[PDB]
Amino acid sequence: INQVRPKLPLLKILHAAGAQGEMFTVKEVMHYLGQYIMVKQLYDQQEQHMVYCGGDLLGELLGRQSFSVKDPSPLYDMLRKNLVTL
């Protein structure tokens, strides 16, 4: 409904950040993605809107070495491709 099912590569990352199950809201997905970024401290301390995720699961998932949380077409492309609806 507003429930989505992450595809495997995304789901792995979600469970890594603590998520249980295979069905989520977009908010839930965002929460756990963000939690993942925060607990793995993938961001640059000196430029905190910049996520450096090369050589990480998330890097592979996004197909990027780095990205700006301010400019998340990388993120939304991944979600378009990794969230299965209805």
Which one, 10 or 52, has the nearer CB to Cl ion? 10
CA distance 12 to 22: 10
Interaction of residue 34 with Cl ion, rule CB under 5 A: no
How is residue 77 written in tokens? 């492309």
Instruction: Pick the binder of ligand HRE from 18, 21, 34, 63 (CB under 6 A).
Output: 34
Which residue's CB comes closest to Cl ion? Answer: 18
Which one, 11 or 67, has the nearer CB to Cl ion? 11
CA distance 38 to 61: 17
CA distance 29 to 39: 15
Interaction of residue 46 with ligand HRE, rule CB under 6 A: no
Cross-strand partners of 3: 25
Binding site for Cl ion (CB under 5 A): 18
